[PDB]
Amino acid sequence: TNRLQDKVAIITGGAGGIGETTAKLFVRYGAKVVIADIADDHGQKVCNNIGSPDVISFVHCDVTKDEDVRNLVDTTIAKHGKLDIMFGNVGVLSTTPYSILEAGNEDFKRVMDINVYGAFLVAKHAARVMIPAKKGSIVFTASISSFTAGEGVSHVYTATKHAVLGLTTSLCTELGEYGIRVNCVSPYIVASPLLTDVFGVDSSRVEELAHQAANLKGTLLRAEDVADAVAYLAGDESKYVSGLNLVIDGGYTRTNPAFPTALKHGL
Amino acid sequence: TNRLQDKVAIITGGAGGIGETTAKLFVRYGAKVVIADIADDHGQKVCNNIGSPDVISFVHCDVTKDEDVRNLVDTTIAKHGKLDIMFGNVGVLSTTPYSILEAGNEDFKRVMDINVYGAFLVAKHAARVMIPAKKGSIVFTASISSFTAGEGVSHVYTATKHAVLGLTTSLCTELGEYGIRVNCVSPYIVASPLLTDVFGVDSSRVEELAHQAANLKGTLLRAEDVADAVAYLAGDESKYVSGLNLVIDGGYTRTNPAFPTALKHGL
Amino acid sequence: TNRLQDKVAIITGGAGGIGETTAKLFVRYGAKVVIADIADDHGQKVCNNIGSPDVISFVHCDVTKDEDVRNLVDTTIAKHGKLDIMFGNVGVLSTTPYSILEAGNEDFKRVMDINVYGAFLVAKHAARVMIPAKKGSIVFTASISSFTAGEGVSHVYTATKHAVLGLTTSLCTELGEYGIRVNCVSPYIVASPLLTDVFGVDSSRVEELAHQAANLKGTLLRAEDVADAVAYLAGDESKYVSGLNLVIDGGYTRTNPAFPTALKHGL
């Protein structure tokens, strides 16, 4: 609760769950945080009543617009004098069918632009103010889709999460010279909002589907667990951690259980 | 012998080093091949070397244009009746500096569009034509930059080669259901690079430093070595390999020699 | 054709499925081969099928005995003058239960000694003989257990197949200096398994469930598919690949289908 005492953090995304929860945690740990997103949050009680107005502020920002990200960073340096942490948490899903036969061309271009170019911009403007200080920790939200595939997970989304892992690795290698660390976090399904499926598109129901399919029983992956991983990478107790893909999946991707199972019941 | 007898192959980037030599090898193995590239008179110049018009042909194709890739695939089916192999061989380098501070937004979007959206289109149109036949092998050219970073290797090139591996992985998982294989090849420095454009350094000079920095001594990585790996993945000798990133780097990426070198060799 | 003409190969585990079929393929490609296994009358029974005594021979060899592996290698050099290829194909399964609570200390030591120390010895004696000639290709049989876990796959088998990949990686890094390549192959379930020994389930039954659980449909993984990958790594068509874990699993390990399956297919 002083783990991040007087550190200045920018969190993009913010009106989504992981961004909101990580902002709450960072404030609890003593940081000053600037929340950014285009949606201009849910209402007010997300960014402004995560913490009090002296520790948290909101900025409208479309991460695919260089002028918006430039303004986000420069506003923050104007307000707080420095930037210690950049948490790039913008990731969108495909709007078109899974199946290469139906997957959309414009949709491929839209998700690449948001998920990869937006991450590039956030990192570029974070590096612009961190490189002169020779201090910084940049964290990207990736996914287990940064190294695995999945039925129903679109080809664009797993190509863009592999690309965010690529930017983490590439930026880690350039920015280590200035003492800046670059890492990413790769979650399994995080509890809520709800998320669609024309079946039981209900958060409690997909949480029990996620637990049923999980390696690591007796717990559910939540936004607070992802926020904990981001606070570890963001602060000074990970000062020699860089280029790490911190997978938070309870071991889900350590196995494909298909053949043990199609041996057990599946006969 | 004639390992690829009767097979029909499309090779994009056919005017380049890997494209031309892989086309030469596939014709030697008894395949019918359709070369495609945007360098139209330049690429049919290349086709007019390899073989006669009944086994090899050239069509102009900009891989970021859905209409050109549709054309390319529909013409191959019209000419030859089937598509057994799609070798997605288009990748471009960044044309702005390595540093994230000088890297450049429009260059980032262009290399992303060619390297990843262009690869998605080629694979999409190959799948459209291959899934009815329940047979096919799709090979992408990736790079050791699909899983490592490098000083002087742009952040967008590393992001897009990670994304190509992402596409290989997610397409392998969808298309296995139809008996179609999807793999990629990840080379180290292939033979040449010719950098007279910048300050000095020619082909044989880069060849010498690449061997000096190589793990595997006594040989150079050639376009013919990459063609051989593509031929393996493309034919019948790899009938159960899919989702493989076939690294052809002589073991270069298996170590970072910097600390061994720092505890000296001999001054 | 005769891809391996004049090459001399040693194949350990030659009485097993992969060993015998790889020996058959290497003879077809024009190689001289020396099969080795502890099943002495049983393995020369196998050699007496493949070819005539001038191109194939059998020597008894316990790979955990330095004196036997020295014998094997020195006999091949005495007979044929050189060693071009060493195919390290010995791996055993645990003979105690999967659960860490029932797993068994002496079984852990035995599988470790055969699977890893046995692989080190084979590679050590191959290097002794290959490094003077500055030529050679060493291939180890690993498993998809060299990078994933599985329910019912013992902890010692997974540890030793990870260790075989470790040996491939560190040997590749030492031996590249002498122009020698070191790679491994990592298969999914090869054709059979025959479990009448435990409660039920035969060969064609395991074959059916392996295909049912497979990513790549319409074909089964065969010993001939693994032999083909070994032949690729063993010959001249892979002259710049070293340190490669050549996964032959039809894309099985590229996804964990449990959560896609949990958000149902159709009940």
Place this chain on the structure above:
Amino acid sequence: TNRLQDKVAIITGGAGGIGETTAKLFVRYGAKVVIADIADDHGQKVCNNIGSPDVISFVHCDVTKDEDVRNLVDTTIAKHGKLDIMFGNVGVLSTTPYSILEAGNEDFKRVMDINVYGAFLVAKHAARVMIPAKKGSIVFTASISSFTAGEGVSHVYTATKHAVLGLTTSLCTELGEYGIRVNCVSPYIVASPLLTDVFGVDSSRVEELAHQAANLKGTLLRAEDVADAVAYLAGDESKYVSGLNLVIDGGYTRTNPAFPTALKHGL
């Protein structure tokens, strides 16, 4: 400093640097710790004066002896009633030459026995008392040698660190069912003791060699940074993290700088 309040932890190794430092941190965070090793520490002021006798105790234990590890765990359950954390920190180096031509057979067997079988035993007895509670976090010390090779890093040591990663993955997949998490930490060179090289075998000098060769400048990797990573994985702020190889190398393994450098000065 209450992050681990009333958690019971066993740390093996202990008289080495990482074990001592992690024990100090765990006590600072409110845990009760049992230190184990054969050497019976440096004197007394390591295990007994890390913390006070009410929070820390020492137990002689050779991890290759099942009776010793059985006694370590059962002593701990007798003293504190439960086991929350097992930190397996025993790893020995090769005693014989790097170079497959000179690397020792008995030395290969000794390091495998300590590094892999010892880890198996520690995990086996930790699982025996954790599985009934359906609670637990097991952390192994691995190395960047669990996935990379290095000139001068022995083949046994990188085969055993790959095997500890294999045990982490395999145990993670079995023990997730009981709610137990299994992870490992993979460091670059950690500052001290001193460590030999017939050159400047001095800690300050190898620390500046390590920094010279590092990605991530301006800091040195220390035992306190490794201890921080272990405390993250050990406590409840990583409750959905399992099967993770937490690399702590400042990005060192994200690149092989040989060819950029043999381009820069090396001409």
